[PDB]
Structures are given as C-alpha cells and as structure tokens.
Amino acid sequence: MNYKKNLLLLYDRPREPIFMGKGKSVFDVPDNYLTDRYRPIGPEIQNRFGELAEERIPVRSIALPDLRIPMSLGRQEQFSLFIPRHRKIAARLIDIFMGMRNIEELQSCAVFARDRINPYLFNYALSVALLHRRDTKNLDLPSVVEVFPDKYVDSRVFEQIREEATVVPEGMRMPIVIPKDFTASDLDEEHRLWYFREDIGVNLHHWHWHLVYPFEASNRAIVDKDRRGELFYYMHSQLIARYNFERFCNRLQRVKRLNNLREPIAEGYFPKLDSLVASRTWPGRVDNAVIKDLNRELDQIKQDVSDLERWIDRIYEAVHQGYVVDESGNRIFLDEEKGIDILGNIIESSILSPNRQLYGDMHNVGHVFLSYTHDPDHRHLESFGVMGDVATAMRDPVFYRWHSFIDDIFQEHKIKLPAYTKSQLTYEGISVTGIIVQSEGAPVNTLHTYWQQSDVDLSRGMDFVPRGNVFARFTHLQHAPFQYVIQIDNTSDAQRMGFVRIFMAPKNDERGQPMLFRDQRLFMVEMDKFLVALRPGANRIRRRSNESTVTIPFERTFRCGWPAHMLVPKGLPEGFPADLFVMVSNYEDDRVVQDLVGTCNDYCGVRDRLYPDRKAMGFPFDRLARTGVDRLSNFVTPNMAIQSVNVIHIDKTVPRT
Amino acid sequence: MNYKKNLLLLYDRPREPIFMGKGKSVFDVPDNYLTDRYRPIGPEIQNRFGELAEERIPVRSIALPDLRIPMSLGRQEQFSLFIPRHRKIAARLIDIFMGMRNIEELQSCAVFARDRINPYLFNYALSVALLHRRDTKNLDLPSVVEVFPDKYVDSRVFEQIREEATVVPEGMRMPIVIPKDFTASDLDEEHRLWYFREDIGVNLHHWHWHLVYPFEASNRAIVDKDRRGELFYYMHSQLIARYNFERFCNRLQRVKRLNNLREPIAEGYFPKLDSLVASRTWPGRVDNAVIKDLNRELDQIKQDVSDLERWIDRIYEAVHQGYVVDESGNRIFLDEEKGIDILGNIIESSILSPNRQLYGDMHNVGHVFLSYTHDPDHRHLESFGVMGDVATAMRDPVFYRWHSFIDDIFQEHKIKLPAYTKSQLTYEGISVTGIIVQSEGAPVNTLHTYWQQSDVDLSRGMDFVPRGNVFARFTHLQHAPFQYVIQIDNTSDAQRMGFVRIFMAPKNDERGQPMLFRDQRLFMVEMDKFLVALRPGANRIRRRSNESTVTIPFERTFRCGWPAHMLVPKGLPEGFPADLFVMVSNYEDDRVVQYCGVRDRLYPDRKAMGFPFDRLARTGVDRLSNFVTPNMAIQSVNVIHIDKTVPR
Ligand SMILES: [Cu+2]
Ligand SMILES: [Cu+2]
Ligand SMILES: [Cu+2]
Ligand SMILES: [Cu+2]
C-alpha cells in the first residue's frame, strides 16, 4: 500500500521536524504529536509548511507505549551500538516498532517518536524493525550516506554545500567534489590506504552487515541466524586479507596485530568528520596514545584493561583446551563443525555466547577502549572517536590491528583442526586443466585498476538547506570488467554437479620470494563461488566479474555485500604478481537442501534460514596443509588449477558511464 | 491444465493395472512399461479395452531413477509410517516424485511406478507430493475411504458388493448398509464408543492431520510448520477430552492411562478389517495381552520395552528439571512460550526434536509395541494390528490409554507454568453478560443428538468388480443445527477487537456436585474460536454451529478438520448436564501479524492452545464459577440424545 512508501519519508531530512514536509508530501500531525518546544505555536506551523505539498498524509492518534527509555539518549548526542547503555535503549525502541500491531500504527508511533529521540538511533531502530517485520518486506531502504552524509564526508564540504544551495539557482548548481586522501599527508605511510579505509562502499558494507546480523535484541529479532558466528569470523577475516593485499600494493608490510594493550598505539588517526546531529566533531587519536581504564558513568561503562586481558587469557585457554564451559558448568567441544561458530559468538560477544559472563564481550569492549583514549573518565565531556561506531570504525588504521589480533585467536583454533586429506578435496573424475582471465583491450591474465568519479545525491540528508539537488563527486578505485575462462574435464559418463570456488592471493611475499602455503593460505581473498553443471567430456566455463557472489552491483550500494569496484586489489603501475586459484568441489557433499527466494535481499541474498554451503567458510585454505605440502603448486589436486595473474594500476580518472 | 486431472485417475482402482482404464479415460502405456508378468502378453492386453474409451492419455518414455528402494516393500504387504523401514522407503519415493520438476514427467514416472510398488505406499507418496508441490496446488485429492475402503469397513460387506455388482444390473442396485457396533457385544462396555472410535469422520481427520504435519520427511521445510509440536500436543489432547466426554455419556468413567507397560492390557480389540491389498486381515489383540520386546528383523525394529521406559524416565526428568539438552550438550529451557512446542517434538520424535538420540521416539515406538503383542519376533509371519497404522489407530480402545498417558506427561509441564493472573485474562472495558444456544423446535440451552445414515460411492476403490455405482450406507452420530447468542458490553468509547473462545465441559462429578476447576479444566473441549468487532455500548453476537473453526463441512469428509457431525457429544436420553463457557480476549495481544482460509502460514493466535484452561488456577480460584472474569460467561446446557435414524 502507500503506507510502505510513507515510512520512507521519515528517512528524509532527519533533523528537520516531521511537520516540515518530506519529498512531495507532508504529514498532518496531531497537536499532541508536536514537541513541547513547538506545540505552543502549533497553529502557526502546520499552516506555514502546508504549502507546496501535493499530498497530505493523515496520522491517527494512539496512546503509544512509554518512550522514556528511547528518549533517555540526548538529541545532540552520538549513538553507538558498542556502548552497553545504547544497546538497551535501542532494544527498547526496536521492541516498540517490532511490536507495532498495524502498518497504520507503525507509521503513527514513528511520526510521534521521530522528533523526540536521537536521529542516529531512530534511523537504526526503524531500519531493523522494517527489515525484520513480516509486512514491510522487499522495501528499498535509503542509503545511510544520503540520510547521514556527516559520517562519510570531510566536514569542509558542508559550508560549500550551504553556500552553493543558497547562492546559485537549481539546475545551475556545480557538483561538489568530495576530498580524497585528506586525513593524512605522505609523512604518514598509512595515508596510502585511503581508497580502502575511507571508501564509501566498504564502510556501507560493514554498517549493513551489522544491521542484518546484530549480536543483541531477541533470537526471533534476528540474532540467531545460521552460522552467524562463523560469518563474523570469516567476513572480518576477509577484510584483513583484502587490507593486507592492498598494503602490499602500496609498498607496505602486512598489518601488525595489537600484541598487547599496555604498549602504545603508534598510528594515530584524525578522521576529519563533523557530526551535524551532535553539532560537534569526532575526536582524533594522537600518535602513541595508550589504552586507559574506562569510567564513563553516563554511558554505563566501568571496565578496566585487566578485565579485557582476563577475557583474552581465558579465551586462549579454552581454544587450547579444545572446549568451553557454559553458565551451568558443562563442557561444549570446539569440534570441526561448530567450533568456529561458537568461538565467533564468544569473541564478538553475541547473546548466543554459551557463557558471556566468563569469556566476556572481548571484540566490542576493545572498540570502546580504543575510541576513548582521549577521555576515559569523561572529565573532558568528550564523545568517542571513530572506532566507537561501526559506521566509521574501518576508517581508523587501528581497526585492522585490533581485528588482526582477533583473527590470530581464531587461527589458534583452526590450526588444531586436522588437515584436509588428499581424498577430502579430490573430485573423482573431474580435472581442471586451466583458468585464465580476459579484459577487453588488454593481454590475457592481466587485470587493470584506476580511479573513477561517481555522483551521489546527498539532498535528503542536508537539513535546513535550501531544497533542490546536491550532487557530490566521489573518487574511488575501479577495475576494468573481466571474465574467467575455466577448462574442466568430466571423464565420468554422467552429468557432474560442482561448486566453483575462486580465490586470489599474492604470488610472492614482501621480500620477493615465492610464498609458502602456511603464509599464503591466510592471504587468499575469495573472488567467486557458484554452482555449475558439467557435461561428460570437456566443458568450457565462462564467468563474468560482475556475476561474483562476493560482490553487490553499483546500483545497490549508492543508486550489504562487498562493493563491486573494490573486487580487485589495486596492484602497482609496474604490475603486481598474483596467483589466481580455482577449485571444483563435489556439490553433492557441499549441497544444502533448501527453498530460496534469491532476489536482491541485500549477491543472491541468503536471508533464508540456512547458509548455502556445508563446507567451512574459506574452505580450501581455512586449515593447515596435509603432510608433504609446502606451497600452493603442490597443495593442488586435479580438480584445482593455479594461474599467474598480473595486476596493473593506472593513475587516471575515468568517468562513470 | 489436463495433467492435474490425469494424476487423479491414478487414485482410481489402486490394484487394477494402470492399462485397464480409469473413469472415462485410458493410458497409452508403452510396451516396455508393462510389468514382467504382463509384458510378454502386451499385444492381447493393450487392445482388450483399446476401443471403449473416450480419451486416450499418451505417456512419454523417460529415464526413471532406480526404483529398487521403493519396490523393496512387497505389493501384498501392509504399509505404516510408524515402522522405521517404511519411513525410509516412502521418504525416498516422495523424493523421486518431488524431484521430477515437470508436471508431465511426474505423470510419466507415476504411471510406470504405480503397478510396481505397494498401493498404500503409492497413495501416500503421491498424496504428499501433490499437496506440497507448487504446480499441483489446490488439487482436490479423492477421499482415502473411496480408494481404500478396506481400512474403514467391516470385511463382510466386500462379498456382498461383489455379489450385488455381478448379479444385479446398474440402476437397480440396492445401497449396501455398513454394519455399526460390530466389533464387540454388550459384555464389553467399550463397545458403546463405536460411534466415535469407528466413525469414518474422525479416522479421516486423524489420517489427514498426519499428512499435513509429518514428523519425518526429506527436507526439514515441510516438517517444520509453525508450532507443530504444540499442535501435536493439543490436537491429540482434544481427542481424549472429547473421548472422555463421550465416555461420560455412556455411563463409563474417564479413560485410564497406561501407567506402566509391564502390566497387562485389559481391553482387547478385534477390528474386523480385511486388507484387500495384503489379502489378509489385520490381527486382533486378546484380553490381557502383555507388551513384549520387538525383534522384527525384516521391518528393521530392534527395541526392548526397557528402551521405551528409559526414554520416558528421561523425558519426565527433563520436564521436572525444566530444560532439555541438545546433541551438542547445550541446554534449552522449557519456558512459557516454546516449552510445550519443544516437548511435543521430543515426545513422539519429530526430526525437530533437539536430541532424538537421548529422548527417543517415544509416542511412535509405543504404537508399534502395542500393535505387535501377538507376534513380536516375527516367528508367526504376521503383520501389525490396527494400532500400527495412523489410518486405523483410533479404532482400538488402547489408543486412548496410550494417548492418555502421553498427555499426563505434557500436563506435568503445564502445571509448572505460572497461573494466569486476574490481569492477564481480563479485558478492561469488555463484559460478557450471557451466552445461550437455540435449536429449531427445542427449548433454549438444549442440544439434541441422534443417528443419521449417509451415502458414499466406494466404486473407485472396488478393484476387479463390475463397473457401475456402489453406494454404502454409513450410520453416524449427528446433532440438530444450533446457534450461540452472546451479550457483550463495550463501555470504552471505541471499537474493540476481541477473540471469542468457546469451550464446553461436563457440569458435575460422580457425586452430583459442581466439578472443581483442577478436574474440569482438562475436560473442556473447544467448540469455536473467531474474531469479532464490538461497537461501543451493547453488542448481540450470533454464531451458527456450522461456522465453527474447529470443524469442517460434511462435503469435505464424504463428498484437516474435525467432522461436523461429531461437534456435539452424544449426551443421554434423560439429558446430560454441561457447562458452556465463552471468553472474549483482547485480540490486539492475541493477533499475529503475517477450515480457516488457505493453510500454509503460521498459527493465527499468540495465546497457548487451549489457552483459558491450559494452566493451573490462580490462588483463591476453586471452580469455574469463581475462575470467571467479567469478559467471560458460563451457561448450563443440557445434551439430549434420541435413538432414532433421521434422513439428510
Ligand atoms: Cu564489524
Ligand atoms: Cu569490529
Ligand atoms: Cu496421531
Ligand atoms: Cu498416536
């Protein structure tokens, strides 16, 4: 009905009162729905903003459950899901929206609440409720860049957008270029990774992943998704694999983990963001900041560094022991199947953790510690730095150090699992004899990258700015389109089903030697995974880069999955050598019997109960090598193939077409 | 298309070869589709009936997966979904039919298989496939009475139907009366409940319920229906409530549970059925038969009584402990919300059970033990008695004892739940001031029952019988139509939505006083549950007996739902006193944002099944008349039976 489309208007101009009129509509709000500030002059307002509106949306007056807790958070305050207290506020609000009887009342509750609670919080609480209600499915949720550009753009632009919108008439407005490589100069070698850390795409993917797989609320409210623990492990694990790749393409070494929390943090980061909702800027972190015990009375944080250290010591113990202990005292075994999934819920701390009290909230609390080095006891009345918000956490270099450490802990479990036997990863009959890649106007086995400007309308997000269009020009990494061509022989006499699993890693190390397996296995980034039917004899399989199951299209992100333009590492101008790897596994073993919708539920989707692959995530390379194996070229079975690829960057700006 | 209608022809005459022609059609069965018995004389056969057919259905020759497993079960053997081995065979066949994507290849696979596999098995496997594919939806499957009358009718009639059909010309054929109250004489007081145990209607309802909610099925999608565990609890729980009602109307006490499996079973039952597919009869059970350890090597059953006892001991422990343990070792808590649902899947064992290995297959294995007392080690090469088949299980009195026990186990959990507070079952503003019932030509607050003959065409099920019509006359309980009239006051100033929940129980005890709540709560049978919009002030709600959400129409059964004619207990000639109860709950709380429209999504009521009375009374409450809140009402009803046979 219309109602579905009317809720989307709430996302429009988050700080402009709801009675000011969104898009080509306006809400006809009761007087008891007006805020205390504006209610005493309600007559003057409803009339004043009624003009220029095609439609007028009525709203029925209900009682509405108590909004005390939702309103506890200040309006000009920041909102993070990492902070213990905010979690309890969101879960209260989400409960109101995710218990609202009708689509009429959801709209009524929302319209009332919207101008009383924190915009950032409202956006989150609504998102999730709509996302997981059974009568608001298939809904096109606005990009959070468009509603909250302050979390994605240098603060400098805002006063230019205000100038341009006020001075120049619509239609004649110049697109505002968004600064890139702006957080640090060349004295800081970390500045080279701007195109990854600060890319709009990857920050949106991270934010959205945490939307659809929260770690707190209610198991029916989306917490208990199949293998979400393993997902948490793998997704974040691939972030660092991809990051480490991009590091090698900028003449840097692999990211160093956060060994121990008492030693200083070498790499500072000033993010250059200004929260228009908080009306303040995010604090920076200086070079050689030290983690400090937190005592944030307001936020309900009383945590010592030793608490964190204690959790880590215990988690390590469990991993080595090989089992964990639940609240009850019983033992649960970290086996080949569910071990990783359990560990994930323990480490991030999802209510699915079999003993939160013992093994703690290790990952999340780390994000808070790192974000509050500048003001840990609240004596300076300052908010958290960028690592305290999922929306912005990936911008800071320390993210990759903290997430690198966490990964080492997971690894400590994976190296205990028994090596995959020759048998286990052989496909009797199937043999892959070669894989190549071809781009239009480029040699075989060669990928190209470059810069590309794209445009985004940030109009809906610019509160109290003259109406009209406000286009912003993003510069971001892009790759030339390509396609894989895989030669597979059947030699069976029957149609064979198979999973095509495509990863890509560096060929050599930082010192220029052909990488060993033990090293290289951890640097393999997944590039594609798809089902294929093989006829007897010979089969030529072709797969386009844009069909990737790791990626989501341009149009989806701007106008949940990994951004398409970030699919290929940057490489070097002189060319960066890389091993492309493909494996065909026996789909009959890997199959997950299931009924599936597969239509852009941002990647097909996988919002259906189960995850569509019985094998472990990162399956060929998640475990150690079997005896005798030493490098990729002798790890291989017949049903696998390796290919030398060369990744060439070109420092030029192509248009978006 | 036609294809949908052509599959329905497979259900016609299950034991007549598929090339003999069904209805006004015939299949053009290839010569390599003829069975090894019939292939060598294909020429003479194909053109025996070759002219006399209006339509001729072609059938394309396809690959056809290996049908070894489906064909493992003998053709002259009995089926049963309780037997472990049959489950694996059926689930595999279901998988084949289900796995042919095209609706034309399904017809081809079916036509081939039909004459190679066990008819009972075929019928099940097809029924399940059709009901749960997308292309074959809303397809009206023929009543299993019409295709397999042997499971529903005294064997005596069959030789009369054969005589009548051979001797007398069509049009002059007399309807065959089906014997009633034929399994036992008046020396057995259990014989009085024939009209319930042996009623066609209720046996069909039971069979069909297990069709749409299986407990084992390749793909955990069709087994995983919303609250199927709680459904399993409640549905079966209502069977016994209704049975116990009918017992009181025949001067009997409440059904005694199977306290322990070592003690003899007092009540024997000879069902008098003859399987025309097995060409044998179902075995009877003698008086004072004892359960015995099973070793049915063929059927793949190796179970000791102590195994059953061990499962029970463990389930009781879990229920008292208040939690279960999954395969992984984790604990899951039997809370107010999902507790009952979990327990249901545990008891009887649905693949949804969080730990089958520990808590076992308790309900199902019980059905097998009870059905094999006469031959537990297969030394006598005899098949299972009536309790071994869902289609026939309700005929035996022991069914209600075994299902009575099982219910007590569920109860043990329900009595742990906290009593519903005055608050929880009050509807602020709403007040029900009275409920009555009226039948045409009968005093107020009075229900009538009687016997009624109905007719069913068993023609499609009578294999190798001269074609024509074969009408059978069933005698079954019936009630005079009636309607409820409910007086509800709003006193709010706004339109209030509400759920009307109507139950009926016996009024008094054996000593002649008002029954106490603790007792009476378990004897309340659901009569209706429907949504109503109330205007401010006063509202007069009227509801017909035939609008009941517990029931399905006549036409569906004869031509899943409780039979309409069985909606009202029998009562006595002198009149049987009963308390009619109604409650209006706040639909806003009970609502679930998504017999009762299309079934395939959710159970439309957030409240527990049997909601007013599933839990113990709050402090101070003692009998129904002080359990009541304003938004409830009680009414004395009198149920009168009349021993006469009315026409339709
Ligand atoms: Cu994250
Ligand atoms: Cu993180
Ligand atoms: Cu049953
Ligand atoms: Cu049963």
Q: DSSP string covering A159-194, please?
A: HHHHHHHHHS-TTSPPPEEPP-S-S--TTSGGGGGH
| Rama region for B300: left / alpha / beta (φ>0; ψ in -120 to 50; rest) | left
Q: Is B331 on the interface with A (CB under 8 A)?
A: yes
Q: How many CB atoms lie within 10 A of CB B116?
A: 14
Residues of A with CB below 8 A from B593's CB? 101, 133-135
A16, A348, A526, A574: the catalytic one is: A348
Q: Is B221 on the interface with A (CB under 8 A)?
A: yes
Please tell me whether residue B551 adopts helix, strand or coil conformation.
strand
Token pair, residue A360, equals 């703690």
State the DSSP code for B135: T
**How many CA atoms are closer than 13 Å to the CA of B6, on its beta-carbon side?**
21
Contact status, residue B418 vs residue B612, Cβ threshold 8 Å = no
Q: By CA distance, what is B218's nearest residue in A?
A: A593
Amino acid at B300: Q
**Whole-angstrom distance, CA of residue B431 vs CA of residue B629:** 8
Tell me if A135 and B328 make a contact (CB, 8 A cut-off).
no
Resolution, in Å, please?
3.2
**Nearest by Cα to B415 from B309, B521, B503:** B521
**Whole-angstrom distance, CA of residue A349 vs CA of residue A343:** 9
**Nearest by Cα to A83 from A39, A118, A128:** A118
For B442-462, b/e burial (b = at least 16 CB within 10 A) is eeebbbbbbbbbbebbbbbbb
Amino acid at A57: I
Please tell me whether residue B100 adopts helix, strand or coil conformation.
coil
Please tell me whether residue B265 adopts helix, strand or coil conformation.
strand
**Whole-angstrom distance, CA of residue B478 vs CA of residue B453:** 9
Instruction: Output B139-144 pairs: Cβ under 8 A, ≥24 positions apart.
Output: B139/B4, B139/B7, B139/B8, B140/B8, B141/B8, B141/B11, B142/B8, B142/B11, B142/B460, B143/B204, B143/B456, B143/B557, B143/B558, B143/B559, B144/B204, B144/B207, B144/B391
Please tell me whether residue A496 adopts helix, strand or coil conformation.
strand
* Three-class SS of A3-61: HHHHHHHHHCCCCCCHHHCCCCCCEECCHHHCCCCCHHHHHHHHHHCCCCCCCCEECCC
Bridge-based pairing of strands B27-28 and A640-654 is unpaired
CA distances from A551 to A226, A548, A614 (A): 20, 6, 21
Burial of A535 per CB tally in 10 Å (0-12, 13-18, 19+) = exposed
**Nearest by Cα to A487 from A539, A445, A537:** A539
**Nearest by Cα to A318 from A348, A273, A359, A282:** A359
Residues of A with CB below 8 A from B330's CB? 326, 332, 354
**How many CA atoms are closer than 13 Å to the CA of B396, on its beta-carbon side?**
31
CA angle B194, B195, B201 (to 5 degrees): 120
Ligand 3 centroid distance, CA of B199 (Å): 16
Query: Which of residues 353 through 392 in chain A touch B, CB cutoff 8 A?
Result: 354
**Whole-angstrom distance, CA of residue A204 vs CA of residue A392:** 9
**Whole-angstrom distance, CA of residue A401 vs CA of residue A180:** 23
**Cα-only R_g, chain A:** 26
Token pair, residue B110, equals 């079916």
Q: Is A331 on the interface with B (CB under 8 A)?
A: yes
**Nearest by Cα to B463 from B5, B14, B118:** B14
Token pair, residue B182, equals 């034929």
**Nearest by Cα to A415 from A488, A308, A332, A340:** A340
Catalytic, A348? Answer yes
Tell me if A134 and B593 make a contact (CB, 8 A cut-off).
yes
Q: Is A32 on the interface with B (CB under 8 A)?
A: no
Residue A210 assigned to a binding site: yes
For B469-483, b/e burial (b = at least 16 CB within 10 A) is ebebebbbbbbbebe
Residues of A with CB below 8 A from B222's CB? none
Tokens 């409210």 sit at which residue? A221
Amino acid at A298: L
**Whole-angstrom distance, CA of residue B592 vs CA of residue B531:** 12
Q: Is B288 on the interface with A (CB under 8 A)?
A: no
**Whole-angstrom distance, CA of residue A396 vs CA of residue A283:** 12
**Whole-angstrom distance, CA of residue A241 vs CA of residue A237:** 6
State the DSSP code for A650: E
Question: Nearest ligand, CA of residue A391?
Answer: 1
Q: How many CB atoms lie within 10 A of CB A554?
A: 16
**Whole-angstrom distance, CA of residue A647 vs CA of residue A631:** 21
**Pure H helices in A252-397:** 305-321, 339-348, 356-359, 362-371
Amino acid at A282: W
Contact status, residue A623 vs residue A420, Cβ threshold 8 Å = yes
Contact status, residue B437 vs residue B580, Cβ threshold 8 Å = yes
**Whole-angstrom distance, CA of residue B209 vs CA of residue B215:** 11
**In chain A, count of helices (H) and strands (E)?**
20, 18
**Cα-only R_g, chain B:** 26
Strand partners, A30: none
**Nearest by Cα to A325 from B330, B415, B262:** B330
Bridge-based pairing of strands A538-544 and B482-489 is unpaired
Q: By CA distance, what is B326's nearest residue in A?
A: A332
Q: How many CB atoms lie within 10 A of CB B575?
A: 14
Contact status, residue B606 vs residue B461, Cβ threshold 8 Å = no
Q: Is A595 on the interface with B (CB under 8 A)?
A: yes
Q: By CA distance, what is B591's nearest residue in A?
A: A101
Distant-in-sequence, close-in-space partners of B379: CB < 8 Å, separation ≥ 6:
none
**How many CA atoms are closer than 13 Å to the CA of B242, on its beta-carbon side?**
21
**Pure H helices in A426-490:** none
Residue A191 assigned to a binding site: no
**Nearest by Cα to B499 from B631, B382, B321, B619:** B631
**Whole-angstrom distance, CA of residue A621 vs CA of residue A581:** 11
Q: Is B593 on the interface with A (CB under 8 A)?
A: yes
Burial of A288 per CB tally in 10 Å (0-12, 13-18, 19+) = exposed
Ligand 1 centroid distance, CA of A473 (Å): 27
Tell me if A328 and B331 make a contact (CB, 8 A cut-off).
yes
Tell me if A332 and B331 make a contact (CB, 8 A cut-off).
no
**Whole-angstrom distance, CA of residue A594 vs CA of residue B480:** 49
Contact status, residue A55 vs residue A25, Cβ threshold 8 Å = yes
Torsion of CA B438, B443, B445, B450, to 10 degrees: -80
Contact status, residue A180 vs residue A475, Cβ threshold 8 Å = yes
Q: How is A232-287 classified by DSSP, letter by letter?
A: HHHHHHHHHHHHHHHHHTTT-PPPPP---TTS-B---B----B-TTTSSBPPPB-T
- The distance of B16 to chain A (nearest Cα, Å) reads 37
Question: Nearest ligand, CA of residue A361?
Answer: 2
Tell me if B330 and A333 make a contact (CB, 8 A cut-off).
no
User: Which of B219, B329, B591 comes nearest A332 by C-beta?
Assistant: B329
Burial of A639 per CB tally in 10 Å (0-12, 13-18, 19+) = buried
**Whole-angstrom distance, CA of residue A147 vs CA of residue A127:** 12
Contact status, residue A495 vs residue A182, Cβ threshold 8 Å = no
Strand partners, B137: none
φ, ψ of residue B380 to 5 degrees: the values are -100, 5
User: Which of B328, B591, B593 comes nearest A332 by C-beta?
Assistant: B328
Ligand 1 centroid distance, CA of A565 (Å): 20
Tell me if B330 and A595 make a contact (CB, 8 A cut-off).
no
**Nearest by Cα to B528 from B571, B580, B479, B476:** B580
Tell me if B593 and A133 make a contact (CB, 8 A cut-off).
yes
Q: How many CB atoms lie within 10 A of CB A60?
A: 11
What length does chain B have? Answer: 648
Q: Is A60 on the interface with B (CB under 8 A)?
A: no
Experimental technique for the deposited model: X-ray
State the DSSP code for A289: B
User: Which of B219, B328, B591 comes nearest A101 by C-beta?
Assistant: B591
Q: How many CB atoms lie within 10 A of CB A517?
A: 17
Contact status, residue B270 vs residue B414, Cβ threshold 8 Å = no
B77, B216, B246, B348: the catalytic one is: B348
